[PDB]
Ligand binder design. Structure first.
Ligand SMILES: CS(=O)(=O)c1ccc(-c2cc(-c3ccc(O)cc3)cnc2N)cc1
Length: 285
């Protein structure tokens, strides 16, 4: 519970290459020197003022990241610099080598996923969310990019809640301020909307207003009726789940616990086979 104990990462971790493209920023594929073991290393410049806002970031990952549907925290390191600034802070976590769900859709023929795959991943997203929510934590950024796979087909979450506004596509209507929603408040239920959009992403290859300029999409999310699956091919349980996820008014939107009982998530006989199916796609590196 102090930045002084934090070792120099020197003979402990090596930075191999920047992970993904630059999707996550300064997140690197790291190597544990001694074991050769892989870790994901998040690098950040740290000032004398950033010292207390960062002590919590570490404690968040320490407390909450010890669930199977959350990428495990390993440790923290400071790469010191001369008295004329600026120290680097390395947040070492589990390296989910199979990439993200975005990678999965892009790597899958025709950029669509099998319905039973959506059911599997969505259950694991919800199961991870249930953990954050039960600990009074809102993820704030549920999307394909932020849902990763291990080489063991385990579904794991990243990026739970500085100057910029990011991508609008997965934002629940309530988090976007307009005339009747002036103080736009994040609810636990916002992560459920985002989850529903992630399921559309998994189904169609991209989220509902991907073709719009981000500013135009930001404007449309609170005005447009709930997004719907384009195809009619989908099962009744799937449209139903998307519907439940995408209740426009958060006040009637179901809890993460209620969703976990939805027939699409609850009823999964191919669960074991799907995990094997996903493992083989991963094996095709
Ligand atoms: C805390 S954060 O900055 O949001 C963050 C967010 C994500 C990761 C992370 C990314 C990857 C990864 C992604 C794509 C790919 O192609 C290959 C690998 C694997 N494991 C991870 N833990 C790490 C920190």
């Amino acid at each position: 519970i102090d930045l002084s104990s934090l070792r120099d990462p020197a003979g402990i971790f090596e930075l191999v290459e920047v992970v993904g493209n630059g999707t996550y920023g300064q997140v690197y594929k790291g190597r544990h020197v001694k074991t050769g073991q892989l870790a994901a290393i998040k690098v950040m410049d740290v000032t004398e003022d950033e010292e207390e806002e960062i002590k919590l970031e570490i404690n968040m990952l320490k407390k909450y990241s010890h669930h199977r549907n959350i990428a495990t925290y390993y440790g923290a390191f400071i790469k010191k610099s001369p008295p004329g600034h600026d120290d680097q802070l390395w947040l070492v976590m589990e390296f989910c080598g199979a990439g993200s769900i975005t990678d999965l859709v892009k790597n899958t023929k025709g950029n669509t996923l099998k319905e039973d795959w959506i059911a599997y991943i969505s259950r694991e997203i919800l199961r991870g969310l249930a953990h954050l929510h039960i600990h009074h934590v809102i993820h704030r950024d549920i999307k394909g990019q932020n849902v990763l796979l291990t080489e063991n087909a385990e579904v794991k979450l990243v990026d739970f809640g500085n100057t910029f506004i990011g991508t609008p596509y997965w934002m629940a209507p309530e988090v976007i301020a307009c005339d009747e929603n002036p103080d736009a408040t994040y609810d636990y239920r916002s992560d459920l909307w985002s989850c529903g959009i992630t399921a559309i992403e998994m189904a169609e290859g991209a989220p509902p207003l991907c073709d719009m300029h981000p500013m135009r999409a930001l404007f449309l999310i609170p005005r447009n009726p709930p997004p719907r699956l384009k195809s009619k091919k989908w099962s009744k349980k799937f449209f139903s789940f998307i519907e439940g996820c995408l209740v426009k008014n958060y006040m009637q939107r179901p809890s993460t616990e209620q969703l976990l009982k939805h027939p699409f998530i609850r009823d999964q006989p191919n669960e074991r086979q799907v995990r094997i199916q996903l493992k083989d796609h991963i094996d095709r590196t």
